[PDB]
Each structure stands twice: as structure tokens, then as C-alpha cells.
Amino acid sequence: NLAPLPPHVPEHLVFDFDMYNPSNLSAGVQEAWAVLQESNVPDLVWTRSNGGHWIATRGQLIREAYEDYRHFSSESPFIPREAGEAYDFIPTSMDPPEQRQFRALANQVVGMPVVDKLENRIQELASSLIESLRPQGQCNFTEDYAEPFPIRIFMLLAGLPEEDIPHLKYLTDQMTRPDGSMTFAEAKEALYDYLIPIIEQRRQKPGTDAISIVANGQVNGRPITSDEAKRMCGLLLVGGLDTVVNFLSFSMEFLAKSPEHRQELIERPERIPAASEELLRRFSLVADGRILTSDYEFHGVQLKKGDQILLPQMLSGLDERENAAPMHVDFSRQCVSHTTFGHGSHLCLGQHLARREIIVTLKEWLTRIPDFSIAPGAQIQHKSGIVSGVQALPLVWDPATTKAV
Amino acid sequence: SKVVYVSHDGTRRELDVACGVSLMQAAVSNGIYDIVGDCGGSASCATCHVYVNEAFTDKVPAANEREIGMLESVTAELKPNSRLCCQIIMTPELDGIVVDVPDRQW
Ligand code: HEM
Numbered sequence: 001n002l003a004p005l006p007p008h009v010p011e012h013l014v015f016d017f018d019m020y021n022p023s024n025l026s027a028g029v030q031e032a033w034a035v036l037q038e039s040n041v042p043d044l045v046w047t048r049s050n051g052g053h054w055i056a057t058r059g060q061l062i063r064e065a066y067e068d069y070r071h072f073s074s075e076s077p078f079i080p081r082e083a084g085e086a087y088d089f090i091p092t093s094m095d096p097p098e099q100r101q102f103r104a105l106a107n108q109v110v111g112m113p114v115v116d117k118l119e120n121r122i123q124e125l126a127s128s129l130i131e132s133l134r135p136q137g138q139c140n141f142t143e144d145y146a147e148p149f150p151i152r153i154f155m156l157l158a159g160l161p162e163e164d165i166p167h168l169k170y171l172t173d174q175m176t177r178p179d180g181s182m183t184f185a186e187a188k189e190a191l192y193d194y195l196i197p198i199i200e201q202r203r204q205k206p207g208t209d210a211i212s213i214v215a216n217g218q219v220n221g222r223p224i225t226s227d228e229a230k231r232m233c234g235l236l237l238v239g240g241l242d243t244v245v246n247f248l249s250f251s252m253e254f255l256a257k258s259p260e261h262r263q264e265l266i267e268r269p270e271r272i273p274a275a276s277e278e279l280l281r282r283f284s285l286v287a288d289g290r291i292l293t294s295d296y297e298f299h300g301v302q303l304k305k306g307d308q309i310l311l312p313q314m315l316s317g318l319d320e321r322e323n324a325a326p327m328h329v330d331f332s333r334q335c336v337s338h339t340t341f342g343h344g345s346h347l348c349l350g351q352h353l354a355r356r357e358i359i360v361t362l363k364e365w366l367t368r369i370p371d372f373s374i375a376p377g378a379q380i381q382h383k384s385g386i387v388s389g390v391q392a393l394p395l396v397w398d399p400a401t402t403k404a405v
Numbered sequence: 406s407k408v409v410y411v412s413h414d415g416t417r418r419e420l421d422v423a424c425g426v427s428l429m430q431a432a433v434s435n436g437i438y439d440i441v442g443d444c445g446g447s448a449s450c451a452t453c454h455v456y457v458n459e460a461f462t463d464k465v466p467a468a469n470e471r472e473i474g475m476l477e478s479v480t481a482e483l484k485p486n487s488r489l490c491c492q493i494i495m496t497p498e499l500d501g502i503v504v505d506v507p508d509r510q511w
Pocket residue numbers: 077090091092093099103110235236237239240241243244247285286288289313339340341342343345346347348349350351353354
């Protein structure tokens with residue numbers, strides 16, 4: 001459980017925090033993480049939990065470390081270290097200059113121009129799902145909307161058949177919500193095995209879908225290999241699933257408890273993009289980090305080569321030094337600052353797709369089901385980790401209050 | 406205030422850009438696709454490169470060390486008036502600012 005204090009860490013910087021089991025979780029995950037920002041806690045602390053690691057608790061430090069990949073390498077970005085053992089997705093673990101090569105190629109797949117023309121399909125997918133739930137007066141939002149929406153968007157983007165969704169759901173679920181029935185490495189291998197024949201077929205018969213574009217791309221001044229292609233195509237899938245499922249769940253949990261905020265977006269739909277940015281701030285959910293490349297003094301703290309440092313994307317936006325009254329959701333918030341998509345060269349390459357998914361969901365949901373609530377007697381349970389989330393979200397509504405459009 | 410973005414081909418687009426918003430953000434928000442903004446504005450990718458019109462170069466705050474470092478690796482021609490537009494923050498003093506967008510970012 002608790003690792004020994006390395007000789008260079010002074011006892012006054014020690015703090016009790018398990019990122020996989022924070023104490024006040026029942027209050028909600030973001031609340032539980034905000035203990036790290038209580039009055040006298042240092043900007044940079046050490047926890048004995050999860051192998052032992054640093055935690056930057058404040059936005060200023062988090063941003064700074066993310067902007068310095070020479071001292072803070074992505075080669076080992078996960079805590080505990082063994083959590084990324086069989087993790088080899090691209091380009092998570094690369095620094096520039098190579099990481100930039102892969103990002104250039106990924107930008108051809110999920111860049112702003114591609115999302116903009118993709119929007120009509122995203123809306124149709126969201127609308128269909130929502131209209132199929134509407135008459136029921138109930139759903140589990142996480143399984144009934146949050147999960148199917150992003151994975152169908154991926155099938156569209158990647159030119160893949162709907163009949164392949166159960167298999168892909170299963171594999172990515174095994175990686176992310178393991179059953180015990182299969183290791184992460186087995187599930188990863190099976191995903192790559194699904195991808196790689198499609199990769200090779202489309203390198204020789206190119207199309208306009210994401211797999212064709214990746215398969216035919218150049219990195220480092222030469223053709224992308226099948227191995228590199230599968231390892232990045234794998235993350236274009238996995239990257240877009242759990243984060244979206246869980247972020248949409250936190251948002252809808254919030255809206256289900258906030259009839260005035262719902263009413264704001266119903267009466268003024270044009271506020272939905274601004275509201276979405278404030279929800280990204282308030283319900284930020286990712287927490288990964290970096291590894292020290294050399295001994296380095298940072299903000300008065302001696303860090304050693306090989307130390308891991310958690311730089312939680314979640315905390316920047318909750319930092320009261322960056323946003324006044326950080327737990328308050330204000331759709332009119334003047335200067336919304338967050339690092340919910342990360343920061344530095346690794347900032348989410350899918351950010352524009354994510355925002356469109358968020359914005360479309362909120363507009364297409366609120367248009368049809370403006371009035372909804374948590375199921376009575378439902379105990380809504382958060383989970384904490386590298387991607388924190390909601391286990392389930394039973395919603396209920398009176399169908400008399402809904403509208404088909 | 407207004408910003409004018411001149412594409413490599415001479416096409417000019419004029420945007421209303423609010424105080425405190427970066428010229429990269431305004432470009433990416435309004436379909437100026439020749440500005441990519443891949444890193445999301447922390448002088449980490451050099452894909453928001455622009456040439457600031459010399460009428461405004463003594464009005465824009467100078468580029469810091471980080472921006473100067475990041476500019477080293479722009480893929481279009483680096484010029485004396487090259488800036489990362491994510492590092493140019495709109496203010497009323499800059500109303501009218503013209504920037505030229507190179508033919509490549511990646
Ligand atoms: C609310 C939704 C999302 C959130 C909060 C989010 C958050 C993040 C964060 C914080 C990172 C950086 C982690 C690090 O620096 O080590 C990241 C990376 C990444 N994301 Fe997202 N993401 C979201 C949606 C998406 C979507 C929709 C896609 C693709 C369809 C996607 C694909 C990726 C990929 C490929 C990376 C790796 C980028 C790199 O390492 O250079 N994400 N995401």
C-alpha cells in the first residue's frame with residue numbers, strides 16, 4: 001500500500017492521497033480531489049500511495065511542467081508505472097520532435113475541418129439515440145447514450161460496419177473496465193489484430209476514412225509502418241471513448257440536479273457552447289503525468305531522475321487561484337480557465353471532436369427531454385483514476401414533458 | 406476589435422475578435438483552416454504561425470523566450486515578423502491588425 005519515503009523527499013511535503021481511492025469520493029470525484037487544494041497544502045506534494053509519486057496541486061505548476069518535456073517526459077506518463085507496462089499507443093509516450101510527426105497525421109483525421117463536415121452525422125447519431133430513449137421515461141444514461149454515441153462516431157469516422165461494434169465495445173471495455181476475463185495486453189492485442197488487416201487493405205485500396213488516411217500517411221519522412229499505424233489508430237478509438245462517456249455523464253448528472261441551468265440552455269440555446277466550456281472546467285476528469293528525465297529543482301523542490309509526477313489536468317480548473325468560486329457552475333463565467341484537455345504538445349488532439357460531441361448532445365437532448373431527474377433512490381457513484389467517471393446514471397422523466405423533433 | 410487574416414493565396418478574412426482572445430483562437434473558432442492551433446495555444450507546436458504586418462509590430466508585445474524558441478521550428482519561412490498567433494492576445498490597441506498566414510503549418 002504505502003511505499004517508503006525516498007531519501008530526497010522531506011517529510012513536510014508528504015500528503016495522504018490515493019488517486020484511485022480518494023477519501024471524500026461520495027461527495028463527488030472532483031470534490032474529493034480538491035482536498036489537495038486546501039488552505040495549507042503545498043503546491044507540490046509527495047504521496048506514499050501507488051508506488052510513491054509527486055503531485056502538482058495547482059494550475060500554474062501543472063501548466064509549467066506540461067510545457068517542459070525536456071525535464072518532464074511522457075515516456076512514462078501513468079501512475080502506477082506498471083499500469084502502462086503493455087501500453088504502447090501512439091503518440092502518448094513520445095516527445096517532440098517525433099510526437100509532432102504523428103500529430104500532423106492525426107490532424108488529418110480529427111482536425112477542425114474534418115469535424116466541421118462531420119457535424120451533420122454527429123447530430124443524426126445523437127438525435128436517433130435520444131429519440132429512441134425519449135418515450136421510455138427512463139434510461140441509464142451511461143450505457144444508453146454515453147457509451148454508444150462516441151463508439152458509433154468512431155465507426156463512422158473510420159469507415160467501419162455497425163455489426164463490429166459489439167466486438168470493439170467488448171475489447172475496449174476489457175482494457176478500461178477489466179472483468180478479470182482478459183488482461184489489458186490481451187485486449188490491446190485483439191484490438192490491434194482487428195485493425196491491422198483493415199490498415200493493410202486500405203493502404204493498397206485507399207479511401208477517405210480515418211484508417212485509410214492513417215495507413216497512407218508519412219511520419220519522419222517515410223511511410224508509416226503497419227505497427228505504428230495500428231498503435232495510433234488504437235488510440236483514436238480508445239482516446240475518444242471513456243473520457244467522453246464519463247464527461248457526458250458528469251454533465252448530465254449535474255443538469256439532472258439543476259433545473260435552473262437546464263432552463264437557461266432551453267431558453268437560450270446559443271449559450272450551449274459557453275456552457276459546455278464551463279462544464280469541461282467543472283467536471284474535468286483526467287489525471288496523468290510525466291517522468292523526470294534528470295534531477296531537477298522545481299519550485300524549490302528537489303526532484304530526482306526517475307521520479308514520477310502526477311500533473312492532474314482536473315485540478316487546474318478547480319484551482320481557486322485561477323477561477324473564483326471554482327465549484328460554482330456559471331454559464332456566464334467571464335474567464336473560464338482549465339486544462340481539461342491537457343496542456344503542452346500533448347493537449348488532446350481530439351479536442352474539437354470532443355467539444356462537438358458535447359455541444360450536439362446537450363442541444364439534441366434538451367430539445368427533446370428538457371425535464372429530467374436522477375431516479376429516486378438512486379445512489380450515484382463516482383470512480384477515481386487516470387480517467388475518473390460515473391459508474392451509472394439512472395435518469396427518469398415524464399414523457400408528457402418531452403417532444404420529438 | 407478587428408483582425409484581418411490574409412491567406413497565402415491573398416484571400417482576406419476579417420474577424421471581430423474580443424479583448425483577451427488569442428488570434429489563433431479566433432482563427433480556429435471561425436474556420437480559418439490555414440491556422441491549425443494543434444497544441445491549443447501554449448507555444449508548443451508552431452502550427453499557428455503568422456506574419457504580423459509591420460504596421461503593427463511595434464504595437465504587439467514582443468515575443469518571449471518560449472515563443473522565440475518555438476518559432477525556430479516553424480515549417481514555412483521564418484521571418485523577422487513571424488509570430489505564433491496563439492501568443493498574440495487581442496486588445497483595443499491592436500484593432501485593424503493584419504496578419505499573413507503561410508502556406509503550411511505542419
Ligand atoms: C471530454 C472528452 C476528452 C477529454 C477530457 C480528453 C482529455 C485528454 C487529455 C487530458 C489528453 C492529454 C493526456 C496527456 O497529456 O498525457 C488527451 C490526449 C488524447 N486524446 Fe483526448 N480527451 C477527450 C476526447 C477525445 C476524443 C473525442 C478523441 C478522439 C476521437 C481523443 C483522442 C486523444 C488522443 C489520440 C490523445 C493523445 C494525444 C497525444 O498524446 O499527443 N480524445 N485527451
